[PDB]
């Protein structure tokens, strides 16, 4: 078997030449040549059958990343495994090899206006079609946004994506959440499980703003710091985005604290496009069910140059699918990888 840091990355006589590149939340991501279709790739090793959250996970995203086909949404080219589930241990997902993340990009690269709105335009291409499929990304970030040399943006990574499930979404006060703190909607942290589509509008509205910037534009240090730097730009929320909030201690909470104005956009942004701020505002609204949908972001003004509804294609088929033991998972997991067997 090849070995990759004194591990094993048995990818076969497929793929060969191994270069590291890091750390996934399941084990070791390389870049590797393709002896079929003749190009560098990227693999992905994932050892998730000791626990049951880790099972979910896989399973959930290997479901989603098979059914979706979308130029705007990572493909899975092959999953290597053991030819029974008694012999599988690792499993070895592979992607197109992309050049690289928006977090790489924006540490060292100033975007153009044109760079800023074609991966806006991109980014809510792909969302468009992940929500008419009724699912929810829930880990929208910079990171999860993968290019290649030509600037083409595949949304990438459904370890934390569930089925929109929006008559479930209430829950009370200070709520612990999995998704990244940054890209956290202002609900997550009074009443809401990020079970409605408006949490990744959220997400993108922070991109959008990274983008403009090239820093984060909410980088809270903890979960309630999160809400302190949302505030502090959105400034206090109205008596009626109050009115919506039925649950008291988050509502409380909201009341007790001093009045913040609203910083304006031009003044944090000051040469960033007129149009990229109007749909900022709308993308970054407190009241979830005033915040703008996918589709209407689309039609914005700012996004008029790459704006064709024909264009932006819709899932055929909406998403259905934990309680499930580890071990009735490893057996459904093994069921989802077996088209890509030799036989
Ligand atoms: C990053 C990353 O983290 N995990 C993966 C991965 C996930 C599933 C399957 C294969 C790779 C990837 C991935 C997927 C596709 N292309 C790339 N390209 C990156 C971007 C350039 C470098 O940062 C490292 C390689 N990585």
């Given at each position: 078997?090849?070995?990759?840091?004194?591990?094993?990355?048995?990818?076969?006589?497929?793929?060969?030449?191994?270069?590291?590149i890091?750390?996934?939340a399941?084990?070791?991501?390389?870049?590797?040549?393709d002896?079929?279709?003749?190009?560098?790739?990227?693999?992905?090793?994932?050892?998730?059958?000791?626990?049951?959250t880790?099972?979910?996970?896989?399973?959930?995203e290997?479901?989603?990343?098979l059914?979706?086909?979308?130029?705007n949404?990572?493909?899975?080219?092959?999953?290597?495994?053991?030819?029974?589930?008694?012999?599988?241990?690792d499993?070895?997902?592979?992607?197109?090899?992309?050049?690289?993340?928006?977090?790489?990009?924006?540490?060292?690269?100033?975007?153009?206006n044109?760079?800023i709105?074609?991966?806006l335009?991109?980014?809510?291409?792909?969302?468009?079609?992940?929500?008419?499929?009724?699912?929810?990304?829930?880990?929208?970030?910079?990171?999860?946004?993968?290019?290649?040399?030509?600037c083409?943006?595949?949304?990438?990574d459904?370890?934390?994506?569930?089925?929109?499930?929006?008559?479930?979404?209430?829950?009370?006060?200070?709520?612990?959440?999995?998704?990244?703190?940054?890209?956290?909607?202002?609900?997550?942290?009074?009443?809401?499980?990020?079970?409605?589509?408006?949490?990744?509008?959220?997400?993108?509205?922070?991109?959008?703003?990274?983008?403009?910037?090239?820093?984060?534009?909410?980088?809270?240090?903890?979960?309630?710091?999160?809400?302190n730097?949302?505030?502090?730009?959105?400034?206090?929320?109205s008596?009626?985005?109050?009115?919506?909030?039925?649950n008291?201690?988050?509502?409380?909470?909201?009341?007790?604290?001093?009045?913040?104005?609203?910083?304006?956009?031009?003044?944090?942004?000051?040469?960033?496009?007129?149009?990229?701020?109007?749909?900022?505002?709308?993308?970054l609204?407190?009241?979830?069910?005033?915040?703008?949908?996918?589709?209407?972001?689309?039609?914005?003004?700012?996004?008029?140059?790459?704006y064709?509804?024909?264009?932006?294609?819709?899932?055929?088929?909406?998403?259905?699918?934990?309680?499930?033991?580890?071990?009735?998972?490893?057996e459904?997991?093994?069921?989802?990888?077996?088209?890509?067997?030799?036989?």
């Amino acid at each position: 078997p090849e070995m990759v840091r004194g591990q094993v990355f048995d990818v076969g006589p497929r793929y060969t030449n191994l270069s590291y590149i890091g750390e996934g939340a399941y084990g070791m991501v390389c870049s590797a040549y393709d002896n079929v279709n003749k190009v560098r790739v990227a693999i992905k090793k994932i050892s998730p059958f000791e626990h049951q959250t880790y099972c979910q996970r896989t399973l959930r995203e290997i479901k989603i990343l098979l059914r979706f086909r979308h130029e705007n949404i990572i493909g899975i080219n092959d999953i290597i495994r053991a030819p029974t589930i008694e012999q599988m241990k690792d499993v070895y997902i592979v992607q197109d090899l992309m050049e690289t993340d928006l977090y790489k990009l924006l540490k060292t690269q100033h975007l153009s206006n044109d760079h800023i709105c074609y991966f806006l335009y991109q980014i809510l291409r792909g969302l468009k079609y992940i929500h008419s499929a009724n699912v929810l990304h829930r880990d929208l970030k910079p990171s999860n946004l993968l290019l290649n040399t030509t600037c083409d943006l595949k949304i990438c990574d459904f370890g934390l994506a569930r089925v929109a499930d929006p008559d479930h979404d209430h829950t009370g006060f200070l709520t612990e959440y999995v998704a990244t703190r940054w890209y956290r909607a202002p609900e997550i942290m009074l009443n809401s499980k990020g079970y409605t589509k408006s949490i990744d509008i959220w997400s993108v509205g922070c991109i959008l703003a990274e983008m403009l910037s090239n820093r984060p534009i909410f980088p809270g240090k903890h979960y309630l710091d999160q809400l302190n730097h949302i505030l502090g730009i959105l400034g206090s929320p109205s008596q009626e985005d109050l009115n919506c909030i039925i649950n008291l201690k988050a509502r409380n909470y909201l009341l007790s604290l001093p009045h913040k104005n609203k910083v304006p956009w031009n003044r944090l942004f000051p040469n960033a496009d007129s149009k990229a701020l109007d749909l900022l505002d709308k993308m970054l609204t407190f009241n979830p069910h005033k915040r703008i949908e996918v589709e209407q972001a689309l039609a914005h003004p700012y996004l008029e140059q790459y704006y064709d509804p024909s264009d932006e294609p819709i899932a055929e088929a909406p998403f259905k699918f934990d309680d499930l033991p580890k071990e009735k998972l490893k057996e459904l997991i093994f069921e989802e990888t077996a088209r890509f067997q030799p036989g």
